[PDB]
Design a binder for this molecule. Structure first.
Ligand code: HEM
Length: 153
């Protein structure tokens, strides 16, 4: 469990992320797709994108980046009390989208990388540690739901 001090570090940088959700969403999805190409295959709507330039020019990709970050922000602001927000997500990602937990680990790495490049002053080692812990909590909770449903993997 994250301490009150750790949540403060997480939410402080997230407030900055909310200043430009669309730009952040783009950077994160593009990093995910370039670093782990297999993740792009899960998206019928993005499968046609072959270069970073094409990804950067896609308004649909930008719009969906807002979708991911808005859902994640709703979860982070619950400070661990995210049962109602996480349930629907785990259900859809395990049974409909078929996203293995490993991919959630990949997107967490992308999020951390982007926050570091855009918010150095508010994302030192202490904040990086807190953010990693918050993302691991998210993954641990999703993992349990996956196991219940028979998708642990
Ligand atoms: C922090 C991580 C994530 C969050 C908060 C998140 C959130 C969402 C949300 C809110 C939707 C909308 C409704 C729904 O279908 O449940 C969605 C759809 C989807 N997500 Fe994610 N997601 C995450 C990670 C991922 C990852 C890592 C992948 C794939 C590697 C993925 C693949 C999908 C797909 C395939 C859809 C549907 C796309 C479509 O409608 O065409 N998600 N996600």
């Amino acid at each position: 469990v994250l301490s009150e001090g750790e949540w403060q570090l997480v939410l402080h940088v997230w407030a900055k992320v909310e200043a430009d959700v669309a730009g952040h969403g783009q950077d994160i999805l593009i990093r995910l797709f370039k670093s782990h190409p297999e993740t792009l295959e899960k998206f019928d709507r993005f499968k046609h994108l072959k270069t970073e330039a094409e990804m950067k020019a896609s308004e649909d990709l930008k719009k969906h980046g807002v979708t991911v970050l808005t859902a994640l922000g709703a979860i982070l602001k619950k400070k661990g009390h995210h049962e109602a927000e996480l349930k629907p997500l785990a259900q859809s990602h395990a049974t409909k989208h078929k996203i293995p937990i490993k991919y959630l680990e990949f997107i967490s790495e992308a999020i951390i990388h982007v926050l570091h490049s855009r918010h150095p002053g508010d994302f030192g080692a202490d904040a990086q540690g807190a953010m990693n812990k918050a993302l691991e909590l998210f993954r641990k909770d999703i993992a349990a739901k996956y196991k219940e449903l028979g998708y642990q993997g």
